[PDB]
């Protein structure tokens, strides 16, 4: 479950939803599962998720969780 994911698990989840291109930068920023729901648009841009569609897919995958 989400709250228990390590930074590496977050990276694997990103890959599972076809956003693996962002895992290295999420890993470098030590993003863990518990952090995901609170990340803002600005945090995502800082993590390099600059495409609106990617951010929308991240949110959609979080809701589906």
Structure determination method = X-ray
Q: Which CATH number is 42's domain given?
A: 1.10.150.50
Host domain of residue 29 = 1-65
* Phi, psi at 32, each rounded to 5°: -110, 170
Name the residue with tokens 């890993």.
27
Q: Give the count of domains, the chain.
A: 1
Alpha-helix residue ranges (DSSP H) falling in the chain: 7-16, 23-28, 41-46, 52-63
Tokens describing residue 31: 């993003």
Contacts 24+ apart (CB under 8 A), 56-64: 57/17, 57/18, 57/19, 58/17, 58/19, 61/13, 61/17, 62/2, 62/36, 62/37
């Amino acid at each position: 479950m989400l709250q228990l994911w390590s930074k590496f698990d977050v990276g694997d989840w990103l890959e599972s939803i076809h956003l693996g291109e962002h895992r290295d930068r999420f890993e470098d920023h030590e993003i863990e599962g518990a952090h995901l729901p609170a990340l803002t648009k600005e945090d995502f841009v800082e993590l390099g998720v600059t495409r609106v569609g990617h951010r929308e897919n991240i949110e959609r995958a979080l809701r589906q969780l």
